[PDB]
Symmetry: C2
Subunit: 486 residues, 2 copies
Amino acid sequence: YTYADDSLTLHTDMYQINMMQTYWELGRADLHAVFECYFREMPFNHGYAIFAGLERLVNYLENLTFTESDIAYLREVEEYPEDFLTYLANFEFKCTVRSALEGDLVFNNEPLIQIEGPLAQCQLVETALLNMVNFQTLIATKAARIKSVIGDDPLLEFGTRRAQELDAAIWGTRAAYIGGADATSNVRAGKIFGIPVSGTHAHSLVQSYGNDYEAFMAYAKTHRDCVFLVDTYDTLKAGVPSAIRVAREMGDKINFLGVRIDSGDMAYISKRVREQLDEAGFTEAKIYASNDLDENTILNLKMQKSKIDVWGVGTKLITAYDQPALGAVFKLVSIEGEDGQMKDTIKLSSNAEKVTTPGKKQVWRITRKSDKKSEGDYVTLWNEDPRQEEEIYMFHPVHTFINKYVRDFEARPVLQDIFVEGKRVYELPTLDEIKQYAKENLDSLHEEYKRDLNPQKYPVDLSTDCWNHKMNLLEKVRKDVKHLTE
Amino acid sequence: YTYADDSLTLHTDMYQINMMQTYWELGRADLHAVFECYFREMPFNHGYAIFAGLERLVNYLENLTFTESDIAYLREVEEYPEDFLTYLANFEFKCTVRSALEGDLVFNNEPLIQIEGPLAQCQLVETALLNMVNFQTLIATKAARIKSVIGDDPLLEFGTRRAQELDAAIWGTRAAYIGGADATSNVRAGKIFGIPVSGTHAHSLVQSYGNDYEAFMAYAKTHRDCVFLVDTYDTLKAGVPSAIRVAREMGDKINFLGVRIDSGDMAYISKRVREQLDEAGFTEAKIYASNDLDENTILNLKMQKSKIDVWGVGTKLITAYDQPALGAVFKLVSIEGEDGQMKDTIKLSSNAEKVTTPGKKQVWRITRKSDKKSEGDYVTLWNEDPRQEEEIYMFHPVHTFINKYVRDFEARPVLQDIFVEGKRVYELPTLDEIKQYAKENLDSLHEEYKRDLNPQKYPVDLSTDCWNHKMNLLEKVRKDVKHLTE
Ligand SMILES: [Cl-]
Ligand SMILES: [Cl-]
Ligand SMILES: [Cl-]
Ligand SMILES: [Cl-]
Ligand SMILES: [Cl-]
Ligand SMILES: [Cl-]
Ligand SMILES: [Cl-]
Ligand SMILES: [Cl-]
């Protein structure tokens, strides 16, 4: 009944494999197709998102082969025909893949990943790519949003124990680091990704002794960097005075980094703890806070003048608790016709704004040459290049009466070649290079788009040709449905 | 900087390893300890939860060794001392593990997993166990909640593309099957767990032809079991009439299972589609619905008399969207003292109901002998056995004036031995045996606890001894904090 978990290649919806069989049997498996990945709404109503997922998807695509167990399952249980199974057994990835790079700013209603190649191959990878990219982009963006209210204070990601299974913890904490976290608690993530790892002790150490002083002394005898968790019994009356006593007794034999509070009304507690430390002469000791924190509670605490220096965030960051899915989709936007020419494809819905934008596209980030001012993104059909134009017309695709002519601009294409016909041409950067790239992209975005409260809407505009092309196909399908009925 | 991902053993918080070092260096690593896992609030305000995670945690514990890369990272990057590293290098799991079984009903404020053994070893496994069990139990419970409003209609889990990374998709869909899903879309989950797999085609097949009739015929030529997705262009005007045409032309050469609708106002659309099918003579063809469904929208659709037969649920099930974390914790409840006897441990907080219940405990499910009526769970210290008692006193631990004397009962211990001193004594059941066990446990629960709307609160009561013991330790700690201040 069950087979070895030795492969990601069947980490896919059954729809995909059934469609692949249909194409293969009818000799259409090698029709040239273009698919694009995008999301429709800004996550958390944030002003921007931070792209993550590329390293993951690169590893997946470079190892995309059907194993013996994969094929045996499809044969023995699902009863797929032998002939199709030999096609799968000889499968090797031959699609072109273009993508935003990790740490790039991305927005809704623009392509983030584009896959072009044989129809059957494009179909196979959709599910896995969405599974990876949806989550990783969501968490990087949540981390940016939290780091934005914190400013230069450290943000520590401590949510492994509450994450949605193992991959979510390790890849989520990596995304958080890209987004704006400064360290993780997760040692494996440190090992395999090179993220800085932090954390001293938990309540169990203190309970193992039955008192704060002896546990803190035990920790201080065996470690140089000391942060004491003070709320096992009583923060103000037991924990903090015990911490102070240990720090005085040990002197320069430890680094007394500070104390951690993990409960209570943090604004009032942090103020009194700050006073106890300062009165004892420990004016450089820091206060670390954890416990159900997110951007909302952190902003409030800081606006209440809490005396918190370091923020540990777990559950609400690692699960993106208030919106735990980004909603990215993959759609067919162009397909080879019987005449061997590309035909742009559309899918309708009740919503006339939720209709797919057809055609193979590029996304151009427009910046003013003078002062690098963010002008927005400009989405074109593949054949247009705004670098070759003196002037472009940017209009809101719904509210078309909102518009500007833009001159003296630079235009950067966001989708970059990663694989050309299955062959990798992009060298993977180090995680620190990704984090720096995110920082530089954010530093370059105008403040109005970057704030957590009521950010302005970053323009994502379709070119006149792309927009007219969309409306023309929409009208043609509408007319065809009419002819069919009557 | 970075090492091979060959091990789960460092999938842990750094706190754990730092505490382990402290214990080891001070010769307390082998102190006998007891930890218990529990959650504090019912997920989704549901009447019960369904336990999942045991197979996963068993696999993890049976392979818990420090690899060469694990140790090299701890040495070269974190700079742990060689002596401690040799302890880790020779580590083998020697803890006793007791647990609810997968498919067991579980509730808040009772131990679900108990680990007993050397203090340092218990500390290592906490983080990973919570990461696995939190998620898996949450999704099984969400699936039960959704299946409860569906009744005998099939529930199909289709959320892989929106899940929080890969493990979440495969282990989440397994949990959903245990909970109440009837099939998955995820082929790998089918391969490695034996879950039934389902799904026909997506919009891309239809767009590849540019019309419904030709795509449906293509699918019908190459497959026997046909469900046609009808909403690419126009459900009522194009899709459904095309489906009907294909079904008439193919006759008994296919199984026309029905049509899928993935958009629009499903209540009105399903009624008209039902009429079109029936008027054409296809009174047995089913209507499949997908698109942002959960228990709330499904109950509403069914109460509006929607003509939907099969339900596909993705995002909201696989991510537990309205509450994406269960909130399970691990706490030290007893520790060996200097005299070699066990000392029960407590941790306080601002909340006097959020104080940990000390001691090694068992959970007894109480049922009336006559009619199997659910009387609740009865949590005792380890030394009590209600099977040996004619009468037990069950009282609400806060509202103590709510109480009953229970006689003529059966009492079943929920925590079962899985590992004895690191050695497995529990044979793992098949997934179908787990699903059946959940079904039988649910069939045995009284309807008042099982309904989705305002379920009654299932009693979880502490025995008189366990409750008095808790209050006595609380008072002692309170008195000790007083003596310390003044
Ligand atoms: Cl640290
Ligand atoms: Cl810490
Ligand atoms: Cl005070
Ligand atoms: Cl999609
Ligand atoms: Cl099916
Ligand atoms: Cl289907
Ligand atoms: Cl009609
Ligand atoms: Cl915990």
